[PDB]
Amino acid sequence: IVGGYTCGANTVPYQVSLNSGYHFCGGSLINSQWVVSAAHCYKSGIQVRLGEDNINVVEGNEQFISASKSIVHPSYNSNTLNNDIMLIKLKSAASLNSRVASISLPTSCASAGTQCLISGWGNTKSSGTSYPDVLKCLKAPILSDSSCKSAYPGQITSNMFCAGYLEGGKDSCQGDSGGPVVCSGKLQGIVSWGSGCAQKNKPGVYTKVCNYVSWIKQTIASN
Numbered sequence: 001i002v003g004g005y006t007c008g009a010n011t012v013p014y015q016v017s018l019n020s021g022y023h024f025c026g027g028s029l030i031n032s033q034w035v036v037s038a039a040h041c042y043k044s045g046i047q048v049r050l051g052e053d054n055i056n057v058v059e060g061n062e063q064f065i066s067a068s069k070s071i072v073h074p075s076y077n078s079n080t081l082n083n084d085i086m087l088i089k090l091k092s093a094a095s096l097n098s099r100v101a102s103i104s105l106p107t108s109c110a111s112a113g114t115q116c117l118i119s120g121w122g123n124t125k126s127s128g129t130s131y132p133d134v135l136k137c138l139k140a141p142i143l144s145d146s147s148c149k150s151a152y153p154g155q156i157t158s159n160m161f162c163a164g165y166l167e168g169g170k171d172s173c174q175g176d177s178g179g180p181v182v183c184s185g186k187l188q189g190i191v192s193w194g195s196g197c198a199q200k201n202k203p204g205v206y207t208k209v210c211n212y213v214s215w216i217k218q219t220i221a222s223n
Ligand SMILES: N=C(N)c1ccc(/C=N/NC(=O)c2cccnc2)cc1
Pocket: 171, 172, 173, 174, 175, 176, 177, 191, 192, 193, 194, 195, 196, 197, 198, 202, 203, 204, 205
């Protein structure tokens, strides 16, 4: 997260860190056994780390649970990043409490202008490289689909939306991938892609979660 703020320990209780010996992606806990992340975060040997603030220090609220299965969206295209969504099942159910909690799935899509909270442990610099240890947060509006398409000609599908600031300076970034965009208490987006980070006229692009709620529910129901 570039141009954001320190969230505060466990203030984003659905935020997960995906760990394969090190943090490599974010994710969102959607019930006691399932995490939503980006398909581009797919790899084997994932351990899901819940209740994290400082990802380099055991602080007392963590639950570390290995993934038992990963399900990349059937239509994920790694070249276009269309359908950039994946489900991860935990080997055991998380113990849900104030600091480890699921986030509600949307029942309808969000509109341009809605404010959202984007969070993660990704790069904090738009030019250089600095990775934070504690969770960073950014409040950002959803942008109109027309401005999104204008920013990224030929690249925005109906499964994507832009959020952030066309002036630059405030954005998600590398390492935030797979993490949440939460708007009015619903998971509306997943950190997917962008051109650099926090660059002028290049806002963050996010997976449009409301399109996938049907697939998420039925997948969970049979797995
Ligand atoms: N501007 C955003 N909101 C944004 C931009 C990019 C990304 C993702 N980056 N990933 C990388 O660079 C990368 C990751 C692994 C290996 N090699 C390169 C997320 C958000």
